[PDB]
Structures are given as structure tokens and as C-alpha cells.
Amino acid sequence: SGNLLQVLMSFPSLTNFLTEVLAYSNSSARGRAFLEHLTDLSIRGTLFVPQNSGLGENETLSGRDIEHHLANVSMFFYNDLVNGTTLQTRVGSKLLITASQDPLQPTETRFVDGRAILQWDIFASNGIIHVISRPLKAP
């Protein structure tokens, strides 16, 4: 499939974050540059996307919060992201992966800034998406 934006557009449960991204792009030059980055095939990124189960339509996010969902160095898959991994984001802050092994589970249970990961490793041509339980927050 397509770039990070196109893949985000392909999931009904991710429409509210998409709406925020698109509205941000039409709001400011910063917002437009963020959307252009998501569609740039010469970069790689890791985009954490809060699902509509934790983000409503009446919870307008700031541009800084939106951009903080993009770990902007490279694509980090499930099997790259161990306990204590810190990820630099586009706004200059850091996300923290925490992770332990419940021996019963088929995979490690992991969190990003304490948010549950609901789906790992959704591929895009210029990045990877992980769906999370609720939005991240820029400091």
C-alpha cells in the first residue's frame, strides 16, 4: 500500500486522528509541512496513531501534540522496540517504551508513554504505524 498518510486513511477506526492531521494541515504552514513529511517517500518514520476508542471528534489536538506522535528517525517495528527504548519525536521530545514478558503471552506486552499498543507493525511505504489506546502528549 501507500505512504503513511494513505495507510492512515485506510482504517475506519483511525478517522479521528486523520481528521486532526488534515485539519492541522489546512491551519498553518507548520501543519502543511507535517503532512508533506508524511507523504515524503525519501524519509522513514514511526507513527503512533490513537484509535477512535481513545480519541473522540471533540478532543481537538494541538499541532505540537499531533507531531509528537511521529518518531522521526527511522522505522521501529515491534521486534526493534525493547524496554527502555527512547524515541526522538518531531517536536524534539522523547517517547519511552516499557516492556516486560508475561510468560503466558505470545508476545511481550508493551507501552509507549504508558499507552497500550493495540496493533503493531502496520506497514507503509515510508514508515510503520502502531495503533495506540489514546493520544500521546507533548511536554
Curated annotation (Swiss-Prot):
Residue span(s) of domain FAS1: 1-136
Residues bearing glycans: 26, 58, 72, 83
Protein's recorded name: 190 kDa form stabilin-2
Native organism: Homo sapiens (Human)
Gene name of the encoded protein: STAB2
